[PDB]
Symmetry: none
Subunit: 372 residues, 2 copies
């Protein structure tokens, strides 16, 4: 039995790796194992529990901020020992954290092949993001197999000296993850009957406009009394103090505290539309086929704005009210959005990663690139 | 100067190639070079830097015992970051492909200090061979602000890894500068007869069994040139001495010495009309000094030298060696052409180019022009 160790330390990483773990379990001759490398073991176990996954080993790390050189030095030796003791035949890492490179380097120094999930993304500037851009580039120098989420990612890797045979375009495992989480998660309790409209103004950008936006949300809720608007506020002093004094009295509105990945996925899934200012929650909406209205007017990947998935409602208070209201009064246009083709993946990226690993371990054939 | 440039290295070979850079930096207004030793033999490296008149400014704390790679890197990283920050480094220069070199470069990067990589770009194209050196150099170059490539080929390798043109400078080898410096600072062996001299060196293990025959050929050469003194620092290996001593001891114009130090040997070669050797390393040293070299081999371990006309092959047949060496010593024009041949490794000023490259990055001067082969 070949052992494949997935090493990660944050909840976002855990959710993106869960589909990979699940697909590996379905391959004969392979056994997936999880090595936690972060802080907050309870939070990670909770995140993994949504998918019925428990870790196999945990590294010993400090619970607060540590100087980067000290963090790397603390992870390296531990990681090398953990990977050898776990009997790893292959190691999968994800993302661009310092911890991720340290684990990849430990594996390489121990002669264990490394696969990098969601690899190839580049800014072209080592000073931004710091030290993430360097972390991912360093990690890719050592990778046996790069799992690029897009054709562009593959192009980047090819310009850095990576061989085509060592690159597999898989699409985003995040797509697989949210689709599954939507089914596994449970809606917030106590919520009224639907239809629902999920609202989440997370971005710390619109600090001032936050109030005006809330005023617009109140008026749209009045324009749609037969619709329930669920809004999980970040219980932040600056945020709460700006939205609650405006929405608290709206019987049509439901204010909740931050939700967990599974619950938020289920809520979005059970919603007719998503109103947000977060790029992350916009991509999840795309995978779920849920229409999204971004409270912006530019920036980001026009991939989704390439018609379908999302639409911009600008920052203008009155403009937003009209954009959203116009949509909720146009459901059949919202139907055109839900049927939009997902440009981020087919929900089988996790399976492709697992098959790629099986191929490297001589257990199966090389899968073919995912095509948008 | 106001800006501080830390050169971090931990082995004698690295110190030798970095010395020319250190001295060139000391000559640039607004810059002050500093040395951070990163190896296991402080006193040993300390003495090596002595020849060049360089002292270290700080040393990392490294175990003497062998250690697993992950543990070594972990041991180096934190203290390196702290040392570079406490030394107030505005720029860091590293050399080589060791694990420590990458650990230092990563420490500098994490502290936000630009890093320059000397003699960068050489690749094997295989992460398994050499291990972990190929990985070490590729990792180091991901983080480098300026790569100083010894050759156009090295530059081509760097571009192939995503490095941008503006971030690469072809400098030639600082090793050339080092020999010239060592020759100038060194002193010839004591009590030598009045010159001219011919330096002789034979120690290629494969030539071992031919040493007696080759020594006899050299004895014939010495007898044919009574006015020249042949100086031969003989290696300590008893096998070598049993072969050469009985033949060359007692030869009037042959001087047999014990192995010389880097500087003393460079000085001897510089004072010689010709170098006779079977060593690739010494052949390259002769070329740095513009000293004609005759190689006692049937083929060269590098085509560059032969192509450049800096060396002549004499083969290993005794009669042939005599004919070639005697012929060359009686052909002043051929010897002259060899001394005037363009060195295919560097122009002896690679250190100055590296120094100017750093000054340019720090906004203290224009970008130097690339060395041309």
């Amino acid at each position: 039995m070949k052992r494949v160790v997935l090493a990660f330390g944050t909840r976002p990483e855990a959710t993106k790796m869960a589909p990979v773990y699940l697909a590996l379990r379905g391959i004969p001759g392979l056994k997936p194992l999880v090595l936690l490398t972060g802080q907050h073991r309870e939070q990670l176990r909770q995140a993994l529990s949504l998918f019925g996954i428990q870790e196999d080993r945990n590294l010993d790390v400090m619970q607060e901020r540590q100087a980067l050189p000290d963090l790397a030095a603390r992870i390296l030796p531990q990681a090398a020992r953990a990977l050898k003791e776990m009997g790893a035949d292959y190691v999968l890492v994800h993302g661009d954290t310092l911890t991720t490179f340290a684990v990849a380097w430990a594996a390489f120094l121990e002669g264990i092949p490394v696969g990098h999930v969601e690899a190839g993304l580049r800014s072209g500037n080592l000073k931004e993001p710091f030290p993430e851009e360097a972390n991912r580039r360093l990690t890719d120098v050592l990778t046996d197999l790069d799992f690029a989420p897009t054709p562009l990612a593959k192009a980047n890797l090819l310009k850095e000296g990576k061989r085509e045979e060592g690159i597999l375009v898989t699409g985003q495992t995040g797509v697989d993850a949210v689709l599954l989480a939507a089914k596994l998660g449970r809606l917030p309790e106590g919520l009224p009957e639907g239809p629902y409209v999920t609202v989440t103004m997370h971005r710390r950008e619109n600090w001032p406009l936050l109030s005006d936006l809330a005023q617009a949300l109140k008026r749209v809720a009045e324009a749609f009394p037969h619709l329930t608007f669920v809004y999980p506020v970040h219980l932040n002093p600056v945020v709460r103090e700006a939205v609650f004094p405006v929405l608290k009295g709206v019987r049509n509105f439901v204010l909740l505290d931050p939700l967990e990945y599974g619950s938020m996925a289920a809520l979005m899934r059970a919603s007719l539309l998503l109103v947000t200012d977060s790029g992350g929650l916009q991509e999840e909406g795309a995978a779920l086929g849920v229409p999204v209205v971004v409270l912006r007017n530019v920036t980001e990947r026009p991939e989704g704005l390439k018609a379908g998935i999302l639409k911009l409602a600008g920052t203008d208070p009155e403009g937003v009210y009209r954009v959203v209201k116009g949509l909720l009064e146009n459901p059949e246009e919202l139907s055109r959005m839900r049927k939009a083709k997902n440009p981020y993946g087919d929900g089988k990226a996790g399976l492709m990663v697992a098959r790629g690993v099986a191929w490297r371990l001589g257990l199966g054939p090389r899968p073919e690139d995912w095509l948008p």
